[PDB]
Ligand binder design. Structure first.
Ligand code: MG
Ligand code: MG
Ligand code: MG
Ligand code: MG
Ligand code: MG
Ligand code: MG
Ligand code: MG
Ligand code: MG
Ligand code: MG
Ligand code: MG
Ligand code: MG
Ligand code: MG
Ligand code: MG
Ligand code: MG
Ligand code: MG
Ligand code: MG
Ligand code: ZN
Lengths: 308, 111, 152, 108, 217, 115
RNA sequence: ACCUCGAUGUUGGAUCAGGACAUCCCGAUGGUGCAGCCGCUAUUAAAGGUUCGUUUGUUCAACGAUUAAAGUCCUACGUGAUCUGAGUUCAGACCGGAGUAAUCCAGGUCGGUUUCUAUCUACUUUAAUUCCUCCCUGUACGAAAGGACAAGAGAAAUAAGGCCUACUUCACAAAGCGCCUUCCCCCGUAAAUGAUAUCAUCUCAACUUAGUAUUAUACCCACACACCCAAGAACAGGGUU
């Protein structure tokens, strides 16, 4: 009666109109996604060649899961599956306004419902001509690597043998005691201990008469952004846009991970052979195989490896 | 190449006091050649082991990983394990007390 | 941490939870409409659906008979389950129950729900009805639909 | 541990009049177009539900009178019929619960 | 129709596309290596290339005591006693270095897990290394070996008598007293077989997986 | 995983290993920064009231796939220099010992069976 | 004998540690009665690290086995509103001793209640290390014995941060016993040219190098019902096409 009623898109729609609206909006979303499938024919920004010190954009993938993988030396590596789902460049900002001195590209992925987004975001995506994305992450790039907003990105933007950094929100474990959160030893189970088995011991000394900032105490654990550095890209499924990244990645299954070329010094200038701005399937220079493998990967279907 | 022929040639060149070779059958999952050699003393053993190892290192097979020298601290028994062959350098008393010959020819028919 | 935990912790433990849900389900099978705390109804809805499936499996099926024997504490309801409810839903594949929120219980202000088996003889619940297709918004959307159908 | 000082009314007001403690205004309340009663959007109308519960209770009392004893659940469907109603063709072979009042408008 | 266990996924929130990809790899490896049908309790001989040697194969014969894992990482652990020393090996089915899997004796046991053979007498784990493969008729249900093993003294790796294990292949009457059995019944949990929400229905999943396998063929 | 105080079985031809004693051989020290011994790790051992080094050649604790898990914590007695005390090893010895860092050629030579 | 005798035993241990450097290890240097390895000594360095057991209540200590090392200290001999009460301390009792006795004892021994629901302050998410093996190389050095630097690769281990494909505890998920990743330095000196003092002189002379923190980054960045959730105590957060 006061007028601040919270409405959702379905509230006043009739039974006949609900399915019609669903179908109409989904069709619009897929049409918008298809419209961007040919970027090189849509006034692409200048495609400069790679130079040393050039940093290109990354992707926003979805952590599908994990699986084993075997290398020709016979070793097993656990690899994690990162699917690129409707990853697009959304925004470009210059060095001056990037909050630093390096250009920035915003990239989004995992299209989401337009009925569940703020009006400002909906307007931004309407101007961009794309359906809204679940997460938008900012990548620092050199001007050489600028890509026109709206361009799609694909798993083949990376290549096997490359090293990558994956950043994501770790699994949220809620308020966790000190033993689980910081690996404190706790106190003995028996031998007299009364009501102290998992408690922090002394939290400080008596002299300071306070607790130092940054003291390890019980509190919320997980659900924070962490980055795994230097994960090898073992394989790329171009058909489904899957990247097979060595080892573990932060966050749960079906969580969006930000994937970028590794910043480790050892992999400083390995971007010579990688698609510099990005991989453009529309370029059609050579339609990539369904699966790109690293040299050492024991591909399935190969004759059983014999260490002769 | 670096094969058992090279092994035996080098060992005879340095004049091992006794040499023996066993052809390990494939079904045994260790190696192809089991060389057992006696020597005069620990100094002689070390000299010949170092010599054969240098020859392996310098001869060929860059892609083949390097090779340990086991038994350096002990004086009566050294051993070097190559990709497909293993050499056991020792003294006569060690050889006669360990009877590797019977072990590696009569797999389950000795004491 | 309870990631992926799908079962509420009810009653005095696991066995007590099963017994509480069993009593609720027996009441549901007997009366075809039951009021109970919302969480308990939500937990028991899956079991109600599974009972309808087991009743569909058939009277002569030994496993279905054992399941019904366990889950229906009053044994006069087992013939009812196998000869009234299951034949009633033979056509449907699911969604045998209708669960709606009810004003909070006056006693302890608990979140309350009414769960019924669809097609019962009882008076219909005041179901929520969407807006009429003749409203202004719905008519404008009908105009969109007709224009889109004509143009494309 | 015991308090070291009495907490002043000023501090206490700052605490217990905080918005986190204030009752929030509900904005999902509306009028039931059927009967014009107030209801929450996601919840059933209290008055309509009371109607249905009372009618259900009467029908169930009739069912109990008809069954006459525990453990007498019928193996056949049930149909409720009000004054001036006759079992239809599909109502054949179903136990009839007879109500002395007239068919409610909301009951169909 | 024997759908190998690793194809059926454990329930979870993981996306079906991950399973499609993993099954694609598993089938495409099966085209190279013939993974025969076998069950917990069947005797298998596994030939695997050793990286420690130089292209030399190693053969291990033993009774499959457990089938675990799903997808490409699926394993089966099989047991034996060599010179009186009980040895178990967990073999990864799709490891590129298993040259062959031979079902020397295809048979099912009363239990889906024979881990209690560790506590059973050594005779029940002993199998001739050079035993010759038996032959089963092309059209024939897999034999179910109703052998009930005798256990060694009570201190066991696990409390096998407890109901939660649901062991049917142990002669408990021989080693445990009626009092001990009654005490073990304190963990019965009879409701656990009747909670209908705990059951995992995989009919549709198996049908889809079979369609995928046939398409791969 | 052989820690301190684990009772280990001497799978060896040695008189120390095979001689009766009122106390079973116990690990006194694991020659590893974390006192957890796996296959290929050395350990001190209290045998017959004597301290003797020995080599782990199998244990009940599961290891990486494709490697054998034994029913007992098997150990081979070795001298301080490294020469095995016994001259024969009867029970199977895992082949994984070969490529592990450290000297194992003597033990493999003495071994009769491999698994 | 200055604060506290108007409810604070004490010692050890547990937990968690903050700090000093007068450095135990790791780093960089000068000298050496340092040929090499090694030590001895001194300068600099506090980023990091600094074991497990038997006896004993023990701090210490001895012993056993290790380690790169098992540092010296302060913090109310840090820390009992976090724990424990083994020594010692209260009421019981012995041994020995003193005392006429009552009793007592810096001694030996057996036993002996450890409360607190947190009002305020404070606080509760701030670029790894070592060792071993190998290459260099049983090369330098050395008569031999012995045995390097520097640089690089591989293995582990630990620490930190994550994760579940496998294994294991288990089971729609949480865990470790499992797996994955971990990135630059710090300055003591040694030199070049060169005056005061026409040589020389590394220079609290001007000047030229080793010489670098001006951490490099990375991370995060969308002003504006109900249900479900890998998000969560509430709240918040994400999804509902
Ligand atoms: Mg503990
Ligand atoms: Mg307690
Ligand atoms: Mg409760
Ligand atoms: Mg056990
Ligand atoms: Mg003694
Ligand atoms: Mg005075
Ligand atoms: Mg006071
Ligand atoms: Mg100093
Ligand atoms: Mg003091
Ligand atoms: Mg005391
Ligand atoms: Mg007294
Ligand atoms: Mg006393
Ligand atoms: Mg006492
Ligand atoms: Mg007592
Ligand atoms: Mg206390
Ligand atoms: Mg408290
Ligand atoms: Zn109403």
């Amino acid at each position: 009666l006061h007028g601040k009623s919270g409405t959702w898109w379905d509230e006043h729609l009739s039974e006949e109109n609900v399915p019609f609206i669903k179908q109409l909006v989904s069709d619009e979303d897929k049409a918008q996604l298809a419209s961007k499938l040919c970027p090189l024919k849509d006034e692409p920004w200048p495609i400069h060649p790679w130079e040393p010190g050039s940093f290109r954009v990354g992707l926003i993938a979805l952590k599908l899961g994990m699986m084993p993988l075997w290398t020709k030396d016979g070793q097993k590596h656990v690899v994690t599956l990162l699917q690129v789902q409707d990853c697009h460049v959304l925004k470009y900002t210059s060095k001056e306004n990037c909050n630093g001195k390096m250009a920035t590209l915003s990239v989004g992925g995992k299209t989401v419902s337009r009925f569940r987004k703020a009006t400002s975001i909906l307007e931004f995506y309407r101007e961009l001509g794309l359906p809204p994305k679940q997460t938008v992450k900012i990548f620092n790039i050199t001007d050489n690597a600028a890509i026109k907003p709206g361009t799609p990105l694909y798993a083949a933007h990376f290549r096997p043998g490359q090293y990558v950094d994956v950043t994501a929100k770790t699994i949220g474990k809620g308020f966790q005691g000190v033993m689980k959160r910081w690996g404190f030893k706790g106190q003995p189970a028996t031998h007299g201990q009364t009501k102290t088995h998992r408690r922090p011991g002394a939290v400080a000394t008596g002299d300071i008469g306070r607790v130092w900032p940054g003291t390890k105490m019980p509190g919320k654990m997980g659900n924070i952004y962490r980055t795994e550095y230097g994960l090898k890209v073992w394989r790329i499924n171009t058909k489904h846009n899957i990247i097979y990244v060595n080892g573990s990645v932060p966050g749960h299954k079906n969580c969006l991970v930000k994937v970028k070329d590794s910043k480790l010094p050892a992999y400083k200038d390995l971007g010579k052979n990688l698609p510099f701005p990005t991989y453009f399937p529309d370029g059609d220079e050579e339609e990539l195989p369904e699966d790109l493998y690293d040299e050492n990967v024991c591909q399935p279907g190969a004759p059983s490896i014999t260490f002769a | 190449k670096f094969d058992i022929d090279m092994m035996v040639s080098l060992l005879r060149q340095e004049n091992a006091r006794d040499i023996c070779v066993i052809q390990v059958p494939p079904e045994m999952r260790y190696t192809d050649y089991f060389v057992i050699v006696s020597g005069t003393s620990t100094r002689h053993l070390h000299a010949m082991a170092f010599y054969v190892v240098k020859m392996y290192k310098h001869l060929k097979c860059k892609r083949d990983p390097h090779v340990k020298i086991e038994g350096k601290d002990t004086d009566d028994w050294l051993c070097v394990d190559f990709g497909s062959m293993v050499i056991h350098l020792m003294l006569p008393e060690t050889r006669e007390i360990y009877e590797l010959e019977k072990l590696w020819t009569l797999r389950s028919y000795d004491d | 941490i309870s990631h992926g935990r799908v079962f509420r912790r009810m009653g005095l433990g696991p066995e007590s939870r099963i017994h509480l849900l069993r009593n609720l389900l027996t009441g549901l099978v007997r009366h075809e409409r039951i009021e109970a705390p919302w969480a308990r109804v939500d937990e028991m809805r899956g079991y109600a659906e599974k009972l309808i499936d087991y009743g569909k499996l058939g009277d002569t099926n030994e496993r279905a008979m054992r399941m019904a024997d366990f889950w229906l504490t009053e044994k006069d309801l087992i013939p009812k389950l196998f000869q009234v409810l299951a034949p009633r839903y033979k056509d449907q594949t699911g969604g045998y129950t209708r669960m709606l929120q009810i004003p909070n219980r006056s006693l302890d202000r608990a979140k309350m729900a009414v769960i019924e088996y669809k097609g019962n003889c009882l008076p219909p619940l005041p179901l929520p009805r969407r807006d009429s297709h003749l409203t202004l918004l719905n008519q404008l959307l009908q105009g969109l639909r007709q224009d889109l159908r004509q143009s494309q | 541990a015991a308090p070291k000082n009495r907490r002043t009314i000023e501090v206490n007001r700052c605490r217990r009049r905080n918005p986190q403690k204030l009752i929030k205004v509900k904005n999902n309340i509306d009028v039931c177009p059927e009967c014009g009663h107030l209801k929450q959007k996601h919840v059933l109308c209290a008055y309509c539900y009371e109607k249905v519960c009372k009618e259900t209770a009467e029908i169930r009392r009739q069912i109990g009178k008809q069954e006459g004893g525990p453990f007498k659940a019928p193996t056949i469907e049930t149909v409720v019929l009000y004054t001036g109603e006759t079992p239809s063709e599909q109502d054949q072979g179903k136990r009839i619960i007879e109500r002395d009042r007239k068919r409610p408008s909301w009951f169909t | 129709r024997f759908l190998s266990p690793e194809f059926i996924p454990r329930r979870g929130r993981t996306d079906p596309l991950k399973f499609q990809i993993e099954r694609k790899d598993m089938l495409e490896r099966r085209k190279v290596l013939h993974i025969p049908e076998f069950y917990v309790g069947s005797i298998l001989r596994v030939t695997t290339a050793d990286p420690y040697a130089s292209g030399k194969i190693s053969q291990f014969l033993g009774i499959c005591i457990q089938r675990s894992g799903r997808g490409l990482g699926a394993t089966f652990i099989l047991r034996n006693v060599i010179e009186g020393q009980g040895v178990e090996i967990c073999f990864e089915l799709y490891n590129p270095r298993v040259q062959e899997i031979q079902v020397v004796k295809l048979e099912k046991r009363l239990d889906d897990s024979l881990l209690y053979l560790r506590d059973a007498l050594p005779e029940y784990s002993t199998f001739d290394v050079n035993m010759k493969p038996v032959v089963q008729e092309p059209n024939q249900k897999v034999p179910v070996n109703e052998l009930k093993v005798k256990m060694k003294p009570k201190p066991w790796s696990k409390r096998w008598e407890r109901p939660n294990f649901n062991i049917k292949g142990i002669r408990f009457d021989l080693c445990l007293t009626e009092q001990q059995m009654k005490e073990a019944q304190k963990w019965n949990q009879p409701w656990l077989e009747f909670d209908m929400m705990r059951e995992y229905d995989t009919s549709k999943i198996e049908a889809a997986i079979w369609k995928e396998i046939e398409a791969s063929k | 995983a052989i820690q301190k105080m684990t009772r280990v079985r001497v799978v060896d031809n040695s008189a120390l290993g095979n001689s009766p004693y009122h106390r079973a051989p116990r690990c006194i020290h694991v020659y590893k920064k974390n006192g957890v011994g796996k296959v290929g790790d050395q350990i001190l051992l209290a045998i017959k009231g004597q301290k003797k080094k020995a080599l782990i050649v199998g244990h009940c604790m599961p290891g990486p796939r494709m490697t054998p898990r034994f029913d007992s914590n098997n150990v081979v007695l070795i001298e301080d220099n490294g020469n095995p005390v016994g001259t024969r090893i009867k029970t199977p010895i895992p082949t994984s010992l070969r490529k592990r860092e450290g000297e194992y050629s003597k033990v493999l030579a003495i071994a009769q069976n491999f698994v």
